[PDB]
A paper describes a structure:
The structure of the catalytic domain (residues 175–567), hereafter referred to as PhaCCs-CAT, was determined by a single-wavelength anomalous dispersion (SAD) method and refined to 1.48 Å resolution. Consistently, our crystal contains two PhaCCs-CAT molecules in the asymmetric unit and these molecules are found to form a dimer. PhaCCs-CAT is folded into a globular structure which belongs to the α/β hydrolase super family and comprises α/β core and CAP (hereafter referred to as CAP) subdomains. The CAP subdomain covers a cleft containing the active site residues that comprise the catalytic triad. Cys291 forms the catalytic triad with His477 (located at the N-end of α5 helix) and Asp447 (located at the loop between β8 strand and α4 helix, β8-α4 loop). Our structure comprises a closed form, which has no visible path for substrate access to the active site located inside of the enzyme. We found several clusters of water molecules at the interface between the CAP and α/β core subdomains, suggesting potential mobility of the CAP subdomain, which may undergo a dynamic structural change during the catalytic action of the enzyme. In the PhaCCs-CAT dimer, the CAP subdomains mediate the intermolecular contacts at the dimer interface, although part of the core domains also participate in formation of the interface. Our dimeric structure shows that the two active sites are too distant (28.1 Å) for successive chemical reactions and seems to favor the mechanism comprising the use of a single active site. Inspection of the PhaCCs-CAT and PhaCCn-CAT structures suggests that the catalytic domain of PHA synthases exists in an open-closed equilibrium in solution by means of conformational changes in the CAP subdomain.
Residue numbers in the entry:
A (entry chain A): 174 to 371, 385 to 562
B (entry chain B): 174 to 372, 384 to 562
Amino acid sequence: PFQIGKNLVVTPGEVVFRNELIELIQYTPTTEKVHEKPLLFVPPCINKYYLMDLQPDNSMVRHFVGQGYRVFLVSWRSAVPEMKNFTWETYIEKGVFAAAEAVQKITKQPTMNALGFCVGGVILTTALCVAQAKGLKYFDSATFMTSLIDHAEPGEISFFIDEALVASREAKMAAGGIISGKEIGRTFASLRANDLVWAPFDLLYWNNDAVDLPLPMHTFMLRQFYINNALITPGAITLCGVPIDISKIDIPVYMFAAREDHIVLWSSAYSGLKYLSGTPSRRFVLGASGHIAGSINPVTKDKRNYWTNEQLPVNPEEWLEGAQSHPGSWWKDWDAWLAPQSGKQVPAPKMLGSKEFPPLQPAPGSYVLAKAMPPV
Amino acid sequence: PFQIGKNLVVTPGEVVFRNELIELIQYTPTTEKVHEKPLLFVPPCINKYYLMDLQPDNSMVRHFVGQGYRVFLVSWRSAVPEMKNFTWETYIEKGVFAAAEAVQKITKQPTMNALGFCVGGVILTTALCVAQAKGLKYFDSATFMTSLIDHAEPGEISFFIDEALVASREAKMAAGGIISGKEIGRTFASLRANDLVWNPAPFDLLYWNNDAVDLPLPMHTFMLRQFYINNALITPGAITLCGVPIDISKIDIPVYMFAAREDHIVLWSSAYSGLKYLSGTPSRRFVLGASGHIAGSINPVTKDKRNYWTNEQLPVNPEEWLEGAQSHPGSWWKDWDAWLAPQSGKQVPAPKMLGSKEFPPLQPAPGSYVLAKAMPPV
């Protein structure tokens, strides 16, 4: 069967940093030269990251390392009791910022480009606001891959959030707790039959390999984003001492959505763009197909197509009407957008980590191997 | 590994009638006596029927035959070019009514009870209106299993209907056409991630899901326009079928409605919303099953897992219905059986032959139409 790290999730590298929330994976170079400016992947913390690193042929991380990027990836710890009080803020501080700090220390580069996928995109979005407000310059650009900002139309999840249960948890928040992967899967699972082509056993395995979340983080996510749609209203939430205002984000943004995505409706993603009014530029790219088939659409096979349009009208239907279709994988377009923002070519590093951050264990590390807690 | 008719869809019987749209399957009795009044299953047409007849343990058809019902089932023909002009009305006439006429002729019984599942329930609803208006008495009761009547909240499908495409097809309706299984699977999706858990499951369901059908363009276009966009059934006379202005307040037989609590395809409160429009009926029953679209609908008595909820009161607010409901362990099929059986006549000896002299058995169940594969890409 599947053994994570052995016949799945095999892109070579090392865990180079670990804390109470993350392992940071640094991938081994496969090119003689690399773009100097690192690339940080922020996967979701619902399910395991390795949707982005399945087999070599369909691995997103492997592709980008092969394009010369200095790829680092956040591997989230599945919640256990010592994490029962962790909050959304913990994911910003101990997740995104801790990762960014380690990247700066290891590479000696002052900044990086960031990618956030699914809920990792929402965490990244909030992290960007905190960083901007505090003058912390971690990121030179941000990419949001099938992630919401405007949660007004979150899809069918809207019908299945139990507001009374969220309120019950809020009442007892200070005690913390653990939300089971089983519970999370009833609302946040993202696999559909049409993603299985026709290993589609890889995807079936991934879908069932669930992870747990801290109660405070999860309850806040439901209340503030899904119910209150807080990000569209400046100052509606406060994180890390900062009133959150998406209009303050001030770096180039790339936003990817998939046309047939039933999990993150493409028009709902598109709706976020108008809120990013402090950015110097925004790029929206629409991939063909469904959530997984469209998102994880590799260049190795280069199937399907994507659409581009540099004009960003308010109406997504107008965007699409003016768009140009291009054959193959949107990864190519993202690469072309990222590369000019990635510095000059330098020799590939000969070692993983650094003296201060020595390699700890081979990729894919220990946190991705955890099994969800037993039923309670 | 899956061979339809051999290790799935194996409830014994015979095709006893065939026309350009349907094969009617009559199932072999497994009881010495049967309820006299037959039971007609009108399955989904957007997918193949055999979600209702998977493995023996989870087969709905097999269970009901084993309870003593004289079960007949409509197996819909996947659309081919000779069907490219078929309409919604065709599904009423060549589907539901043709089946009911054959049942009458084979059994010599004047009426039957009907079950409609998913879009089969919608077709059945419209057929009941036509029959009522024309004084045709085919049905003594109707059961709607995860089917909409009020389409105001149809769920995620709303986001995946392109009105402009519907309109362009309306403009060219006379020419007819075929809507591919691929297109159908991009707008309708019967499965969710919880149905795909893996450690046959989930492969039996994936095979069923991927065993796609095609639909005639006029039927499918009408379905999208009139139900999903216009929500025509809630307005008397908003559509006309078979010469008849459709007014669901005219339906005048007992109704049973099933929905599943965690159903993402047919939201249970959306199903519930239809009940208030069935104002001509002598009785209405709503039953809510635990779990999702597949596991909640096809929840067999053999294992008798999960639960269902009952409440005789029918308030406008579905939350009020649920707050007043009583939970019962196991399968809702038990409840449906208890509702159906008193409406199913006396016990008579099981028929010794399938079909009749006029309707001889044509081939063993599950027949030929179910074995057809979708047309190639174009």
